[PDB]
């Protein structure tokens, strides 16, 4: 029977998935704000570049 | 008997993971970003119009150098554009005119194509003879090719319509790994920035995250109600967005294993066709079926400017490696290059 | 890939000739063709170039109105018509292939060439040294200088460095001063600042010997360098 | 047999009051589909629409002349330019409709063959031929026989005699008759012959195809709009031109009445083109 083997692999999958170092949602949100704030000046779209620098013009 | 108790155990496990996801969600991402300044109105101009195709465009992919893009059309011609000068560097004639995806290798040496022929052909641009010829016709898929991407110059992970994604070896031609677990046709994949992970969207409204080396699905984030017409990764690789056919975008999280925010608005009722992220990840650009392409703030869920001037369904979308430009290819055989300016 | 040329011999001045360049081993119709001459005991000299599909035609001012370059696609053969010869036209004429697109490598392959013996503004390219004694195992810098800055607005400075082996056709080494040609060892390196153009060889071996020619490609007519010769 | 100068002013601005609102949206309706995709029907609608706009601004300049009982209060330098501004669209509009109805017949009689040559570039060339052949033809009849021209040696301007102040209102009947007749036989009647032939060609093919009761119903009207313009607006005006040829003693009031109907093409042409 292939059903038992599939179920065994599936339960092993969730077992190995469960044991992960999970941090709080607030920590991930703060990391996202830090990423989008430090790299804000380096984003051509969020902060438009001067027309001289803009390669497409 | 035996299958009944197995299905009961499966249902109990699904309930367990659902309540675990609910408990681990202390709050939602919408309330957390209620104090950050909004991105504001964003204006994007049609810097270029890469005309030259004689039929609808079905895919595109930006090169690593953020200058060359390859596009595939129902005319059967794989064109590689020089987006800086709108020059057609190569015009590869496909064996089968039906193509639904294309890709540009990270090294830039190879480009991929595939479609209703279930063959993910790979062409070698850099050759001594000076022309472009197919190098390895990867065959073995039962369904149509949907979206195929290259991990490296020897390893390419692909997605077919046979409910199975595959990882191929160009040098040999056989599937190094086969990914199974989807109960519907898979439409698109999105490679992680660090190349260790990759997700895929299927016709069963479920996006699954897989592993290239493990060979088995790791997480099955499931919040959508309709087929995922395309999936895409966050720039940091810790999240992804799944587009869908029910006119809504969802930003899932790898670590949270649950939906973080839902992008929708009343007046849009046309399913998303393609989704891509900006370099900083703040702007989530999606190509809709109402001839538009809305630009949502990935942390606020407010529409910020639209690239409305395209006259037909936006069938493909791509953001440059450096985030300098955004390119959309519609069914009117026009590739338009866009960027933000004041 | 291979280019074979024929039509050499002893011709009285003022006569007519026909130089034929046969192309085999690659897609001729998609490759632009150049003709390069080399006077004996002198440097290379440009003659003419014909674009892919006969679309555009250029000639050097020295041979303008006298010599004409013509490609033939179905028979895969390039042809240089030849008339009104003079004693200065005796040189080693080379058939040169070059394909032009973004990231391409023009001047990548050179034909064997034919010997021609005749009986009886433009960018000026200068090299300070003509013969550099050297021993294997060290680093060699070759100085190339240009009358005007080759750097363009697009960000590409068009350098082309060639190695001419003794009794052999010159071989492309570096194009655009930074991209290494296919089949060339990694030891070769180049640099430039818009006026001072240099080529560096990381370590020396017996094969590194040869006359080195630096090229400009901002605009036509094409002009060659003085010719830096390396000897042991 | 009556035409008060005020009545001519009233009828002329009536075309101005109706032609102007329709023509601007006619090009707007045409340019709306032009950006999307260019097809031969767009080009003939745009060229007819643009030439319609050219005529629309000409009516106020002609209307004031009507109040003056034929006099020309405007500067005499404008009259040669006004000749192009008014008389050219009267003949340019006739040419395009024949070209437009030529496309309809080709589209319906041989549908597979017409898909091969669907490119608008062919349409522009035929329009360019109408652009040039019309401009050349009145260009030749203006240089040769118009007052102040090659035949008329006088202090009068290249396009205007001044017995009492007239913009081509006093061209001698001796030469204008044969001169206008060349306009009638070439620039109107042969386009009318093409349109009449191409209209019955469409109706023959339209019936054979399967439509939702539109084979000889909805299609008949729109395909007949091109012929309706020629026989109703430009017809009576250009019928007077041939009338003065075989009947040189016929009164000129009929031509004056015809010019109103000829100038009435500003209103009804955008109505029957169907691109509003
Ligand atoms: C003998 C006859 C058929 C020859 C006619 C040739 C000339 C008059 C035609 C042929 C191609 C034509 C051009 C084709 C396309 C355009 C673009 C359009 O936006 C304005 C008119 C313009 C610029 C046309 C002008 C007239 C043109 C130059
Ligand atoms: C007003 C806009 C102009 C744009 C450019 C077009 C024209 C250029 C010049 C062309 C020369 C034309 C000359 C002839 C003009 C009209 C003559 C009309 C006579 C009709 C005779 C009659 O029926 O009484």
mmCIF file of C-alpha atoms in Angstrom, chain D residues 19-218:
data_model
loop_
_atom_site.group_PDB
_atom_site.id
_atom_site.type_symbol
_atom_site.label_atom_id
_atom_site.label_comp_id
_atom_site.label_asym_id
_atom_site.label_seq_id
_atom_site.Cartn_x
_atom_site.Cartn_y
_atom_site.Cartn_z
ATOM 1 C CA UNK D 19 -20.811 70.446 -37.951
ATOM 2 C CA UNK D 20 -18.399 71.757 -35.321
ATOM 3 C CA UNK D 21 -19.735 69.681 -32.368
ATOM 4 C CA UNK D 22 -19.866 66.520 -34.483
ATOM 5 C CA UNK D 23 -16.475 66.838 -36.184
ATOM 6 C CA UNK D 24 -14.358 67.323 -33.047
ATOM 7 C CA UNK D 25 -15.796 64.148 -31.528
ATOM 8 C CA UNK D 26 -15.595 62.451 -34.938
ATOM 9 C CA UNK D 27 -11.808 62.770 -34.840
ATOM 10 C CA UNK D 28 -11.908 62.064 -31.099
ATOM 11 C CA UNK D 29 -13.936 58.933 -31.797
ATOM 12 C CA UNK D 30 -11.543 58.064 -34.615
ATOM 13 C CA UNK D 31 -8.398 58.850 -32.616
ATOM 14 C CA UNK D 32 -9.786 56.826 -29.697
ATOM 15 C CA UNK D 33 -9.626 53.635 -31.768
ATOM 16 C CA UNK D 34 -6.494 54.793 -33.618
ATOM 17 C CA UNK D 35 -4.290 54.471 -30.516
ATOM 18 C CA UNK D 36 -5.674 50.980 -29.850
ATOM 19 C CA UNK D 37 -5.125 49.591 -33.356
ATOM 20 C CA UNK D 38 -4.979 51.112 -36.841
ATOM 21 C CA UNK D 39 -7.174 49.531 -39.525
ATOM 22 C CA UNK D 40 -8.063 50.784 -43.028
ATOM 23 C CA UNK D 41 -11.529 51.808 -41.817
ATOM 24 C CA UNK D 42 -9.850 54.059 -39.249
ATOM 25 C CA UNK D 43 -7.715 55.821 -41.863
ATOM 26 C CA UNK D 44 -10.625 56.625 -44.176
ATOM 27 C CA UNK D 45 -12.606 57.761 -41.132
ATOM 28 C CA UNK D 46 -9.717 59.916 -39.900
ATOM 29 C CA UNK D 47 -8.955 61.467 -43.295
ATOM 30 C CA UNK D 48 -12.636 62.163 -43.932
ATOM 31 C CA UNK D 49 -12.920 63.427 -40.361
ATOM 32 C CA UNK D 50 -9.887 65.698 -40.672
ATOM 33 C CA UNK D 51 -11.038 67.051 -44.040
ATOM 34 C CA UNK D 52 -14.444 67.568 -42.427
ATOM 35 C CA UNK D 53 -12.811 69.708 -39.734
ATOM 36 C CA UNK D 54 -10.981 71.677 -42.434
ATOM 37 C CA UNK D 55 -14.342 72.493 -44.028
ATOM 38 C CA UNK D 56 -15.959 73.352 -40.685
ATOM 39 C CA UNK D 57 -13.736 76.381 -40.042
ATOM 40 C CA UNK D 58 -14.359 77.499 -43.632
ATOM 41 C CA UNK D 59 -18.104 78.014 -43.128
ATOM 42 C CA UNK D 60 -17.806 81.156 -40.924
ATOM 43 C CA UNK D 61 -15.467 82.683 -43.511
ATOM 44 C CA UNK D 62 -17.985 81.803 -46.231
ATOM 45 C CA UNK D 63 -20.994 82.774 -44.093
ATOM 46 C CA UNK D 64 -19.957 86.428 -43.803
ATOM 47 C CA UNK D 65 -19.506 86.479 -47.586
ATOM 48 C CA UNK D 66 -23.131 85.337 -47.871
ATOM 49 C CA UNK D 67 -24.361 88.335 -45.862
ATOM 50 C CA UNK D 68 -22.368 90.666 -48.143
ATOM 51 C CA UNK D 69 -24.521 89.503 -51.107
ATOM 52 C CA UNK D 70 -21.453 87.907 -52.673
ATOM 53 C CA UNK D 71 -18.952 90.599 -51.681
ATOM 54 C CA UNK D 72 -15.644 89.746 -49.993
ATOM 55 C CA UNK D 73 -15.140 91.915 -46.877
ATOM 56 C CA UNK D 74 -12.211 89.756 -45.736
ATOM 57 C CA UNK D 75 -8.702 90.582 -47.016
ATOM 58 C CA UNK D 76 -8.090 89.666 -50.649
ATOM 59 C CA UNK D 77 -5.026 87.614 -49.677
ATOM 60 C CA UNK D 78 -7.211 85.142 -47.766
ATOM 61 C CA UNK D 79 -9.398 84.226 -50.762
ATOM 62 C CA UNK D 80 -6.769 82.076 -52.572
ATOM 63 C CA UNK D 81 -6.103 80.310 -49.263
ATOM 64 C CA UNK D 82 -9.837 80.136 -48.529
ATOM 65 C CA UNK D 83 -10.267 78.396 -51.893
ATOM 66 C CA UNK D 84 -8.344 75.406 -50.532
ATOM 67 C CA UNK D 85 -10.094 75.753 -47.170
ATOM 68 C CA UNK D 86 -13.573 75.386 -48.720
ATOM 69 C CA UNK D 87 -13.523 73.850 -52.202
ATOM 70 C CA UNK D 88 -10.900 71.160 -51.544
ATOM 71 C CA UNK D 89 -12.833 69.258 -48.812
ATOM 72 C CA UNK D 90 -15.903 69.331 -51.075
ATOM 73 C CA UNK D 91 -13.891 67.168 -53.479
ATOM 74 C CA UNK D 92 -11.624 65.447 -50.944
ATOM 75 C CA UNK D 93 -14.632 64.075 -49.064
ATOM 76 C CA UNK D 94 -15.987 62.502 -52.234
ATOM 77 C CA UNK D 95 -12.744 60.668 -52.945
ATOM 78 C CA UNK D 96 -12.377 59.080 -49.509
ATOM 79 C CA UNK D 97 -15.902 57.643 -49.463
ATOM 80 C CA UNK D 98 -15.198 55.878 -52.755
ATOM 81 C CA UNK D 99 -11.971 54.575 -51.228
ATOM 82 C CA UNK D 100 -13.838 53.660 -48.038
ATOM 83 C CA UNK D 101 -16.571 51.825 -49.946
ATOM 84 C CA UNK D 102 -13.840 50.162 -52.010
ATOM 85 C CA UNK D 103 -12.519 48.651 -48.790
ATOM 86 C CA UNK D 104 -15.974 47.456 -47.745
ATOM 87 C CA UNK D 105 -16.474 45.638 -51.053
ATOM 88 C CA UNK D 106 -13.011 44.067 -50.848
ATOM 89 C CA UNK D 107 -13.633 43.152 -47.214
ATOM 90 C CA UNK D 108 -16.900 41.350 -47.943
ATOM 91 C CA UNK D 109 -16.555 39.994 -51.492
ATOM 92 C CA UNK D 110 -13.159 38.318 -50.932
ATOM 93 C CA UNK D 111 -12.752 38.142 -47.141
ATOM 94 C CA UNK D 112 -9.767 35.775 -47.200
ATOM 95 C CA UNK D 113 -7.882 37.844 -49.767
ATOM 96 C CA UNK D 114 -8.523 41.084 -47.885
ATOM 97 C CA UNK D 115 -7.025 39.653 -44.683
ATOM 98 C CA UNK D 116 -3.705 39.287 -46.518
ATOM 99 C CA UNK D 117 -3.497 43.005 -47.382
ATOM 100 C CA UNK D 118 -5.031 44.344 -44.161
ATOM 101 C CA UNK D 119 -2.070 46.670 -43.540
ATOM 102 C CA UNK D 120 -2.995 50.367 -43.088
ATOM 103 C CA UNK D 121 0.093 51.342 -45.117
ATOM 104 C CA UNK D 122 -1.787 50.481 -48.310
ATOM 105 C CA UNK D 123 -4.716 52.587 -47.083
ATOM 106 C CA UNK D 124 -2.490 55.606 -46.423
ATOM 107 C CA UNK D 125 -1.049 55.387 -49.939
ATOM 108 C CA UNK D 126 -4.507 55.413 -51.507
ATOM 109 C CA UNK D 127 -5.355 58.306 -49.191
ATOM 110 C CA UNK D 128 -2.073 59.929 -50.225
ATOM 111 C CA UNK D 129 -3.111 59.522 -53.858
ATOM 112 C CA UNK D 130 -6.405 61.206 -52.971
ATOM 113 C CA UNK D 131 -4.349 63.681 -50.936
ATOM 114 C CA UNK D 132 -2.237 64.567 -53.974
ATOM 115 C CA UNK D 133 -4.455 63.964 -57.013
ATOM 116 C CA UNK D 134 -7.176 66.203 -55.583
ATOM 117 C CA UNK D 135 -4.694 68.878 -54.504
ATOM 118 C CA UNK D 136 -2.906 68.701 -57.861
ATOM 119 C CA UNK D 137 -6.132 68.819 -59.869
ATOM 120 C CA UNK D 138 -7.535 72.034 -58.413
ATOM 121 C CA UNK D 139 -3.913 73.141 -58.188
ATOM 122 C CA UNK D 140 -3.682 72.872 -61.972
ATOM 123 C CA UNK D 141 -7.079 74.445 -62.678
ATOM 124 C CA UNK D 142 -6.183 77.306 -60.310
ATOM 125 C CA UNK D 143 -2.820 78.066 -61.900
ATOM 126 C CA UNK D 144 -4.103 77.728 -65.467
ATOM 127 C CA UNK D 145 -7.617 79.155 -65.815
ATOM 128 C CA UNK D 146 -8.530 80.780 -62.491
ATOM 129 C CA UNK D 147 -8.835 84.591 -62.539
ATOM 130 C CA UNK D 148 -5.509 86.304 -62.016
ATOM 131 C CA UNK D 149 -3.798 83.113 -63.183
ATOM 132 C CA UNK D 150 -2.119 81.923 -66.360
ATOM 133 C CA UNK D 151 -5.070 82.581 -68.696
ATOM 134 C CA UNK D 152 -6.304 85.749 -66.907
ATOM 135 C CA UNK D 153 -3.614 88.477 -67.088
ATOM 136 C CA UNK D 154 -4.841 91.252 -64.732
ATOM 137 C CA UNK D 155 -4.028 93.246 -61.542
ATOM 138 C CA UNK D 156 -6.610 90.904 -59.895
ATOM 139 C CA UNK D 157 -5.070 88.482 -57.336
ATOM 140 C CA UNK D 158 -4.192 84.842 -58.218
ATOM 141 C CA UNK D 159 -7.539 83.699 -56.752
ATOM 142 C CA UNK D 160 -9.886 86.731 -56.779
ATOM 143 C CA UNK D 161 -11.364 89.246 -59.242
ATOM 144 C CA UNK D 162 -12.831 92.489 -57.881
ATOM 145 C CA UNK D 163 -15.558 93.900 -60.136
ATOM 146 C CA UNK D 164 -17.578 94.843 -57.050
ATOM 147 C CA UNK D 165 -16.638 93.982 -53.466
ATOM 148 C CA UNK D 166 -15.438 88.234 -54.922
ATOM 149 C CA UNK D 167 -13.824 84.856 -54.095
ATOM 150 C CA UNK D 168 -14.140 82.947 -57.436
ATOM 151 C CA UNK D 169 -17.741 84.271 -57.657
ATOM 152 C CA UNK D 170 -17.092 86.039 -61.003
ATOM 153 C CA UNK D 171 -15.096 83.332 -62.864
ATOM 154 C CA UNK D 172 -16.218 83.834 -66.519
ATOM 155 C CA UNK D 173 -18.737 81.101 -67.572
ATOM 156 C CA UNK D 174 -16.794 80.688 -70.825
ATOM 157 C CA UNK D 175 -13.862 78.871 -69.197
ATOM 158 C CA UNK D 176 -15.187 77.859 -65.766
ATOM 159 C CA UNK D 177 -17.798 75.553 -67.302
ATOM 160 C CA UNK D 178 -15.322 73.198 -68.965
ATOM 161 C CA UNK D 179 -12.972 73.758 -66.016
ATOM 162 C CA UNK D 180 -15.486 72.700 -63.334
ATOM 163 C CA UNK D 181 -16.696 69.874 -65.587
ATOM 164 C CA UNK D 182 -13.261 68.274 -65.211
ATOM 165 C CA UNK D 183 -13.754 68.419 -61.439
ATOM 166 C CA UNK D 184 -17.160 66.770 -61.854
ATOM 167 C CA UNK D 185 -16.103 63.975 -64.210
ATOM 168 C CA UNK D 186 -12.884 63.120 -62.349
ATOM 169 C CA UNK D 187 -13.113 64.042 -58.662
ATOM 170 C CA UNK D 188 -16.805 63.271 -58.036
ATOM 171 C CA UNK D 189 -18.543 61.141 -60.661
ATOM 172 C CA UNK D 190 -15.894 58.430 -60.994
ATOM 173 C CA UNK D 191 -15.744 58.164 -57.167
ATOM 174 C CA UNK D 192 -19.536 57.979 -57.355
ATOM 175 C CA UNK D 193 -19.224 55.209 -59.947
ATOM 176 C CA UNK D 194 -16.824 53.347 -57.647
ATOM 177 C CA UNK D 195 -19.103 53.800 -54.633
ATOM 178 C CA UNK D 196 -22.227 52.735 -56.530
ATOM 179 C CA UNK D 197 -20.453 49.630 -57.833
ATOM 180 C CA UNK D 198 -18.890 48.892 -54.440
ATOM 181 C CA UNK D 199 -22.226 49.372 -52.658
ATOM 182 C CA UNK D 200 -24.059 46.752 -54.720
ATOM 183 C CA UNK D 201 -21.039 44.486 -54.309
ATOM 184 C CA UNK D 202 -21.355 44.619 -50.524
ATOM 185 C CA UNK D 203 -25.091 43.892 -50.586
ATOM 186 C CA UNK D 204 -24.542 40.870 -52.830
ATOM 187 C CA UNK D 205 -21.947 39.425 -50.447
ATOM 188 C CA UNK D 206 -23.608 40.588 -47.203
ATOM 189 C CA UNK D 207 -26.690 38.391 -47.904
ATOM 190 C CA UNK D 208 -24.649 35.187 -48.522
ATOM 191 C CA UNK D 209 -23.044 35.304 -45.022
ATOM 192 C CA UNK D 210 -24.837 34.240 -41.815
ATOM 193 C CA UNK D 211 -25.776 37.180 -39.532
ATOM 194 C CA UNK D 212 -28.325 37.679 -36.712
ATOM 195 C CA UNK D 213 -30.815 39.312 -39.160
ATOM 196 C CA UNK D 214 -28.116 41.926 -40.006
ATOM 197 C CA UNK D 215 -27.051 40.552 -43.424
ATOM 198 C CA UNK D 216 -29.239 43.049 -45.387
ATOM 199 C CA UNK D 217 -30.587 45.092 -42.434
ATOM 200 C CA UNK D 218 -28.067 46.735 -40.029
#
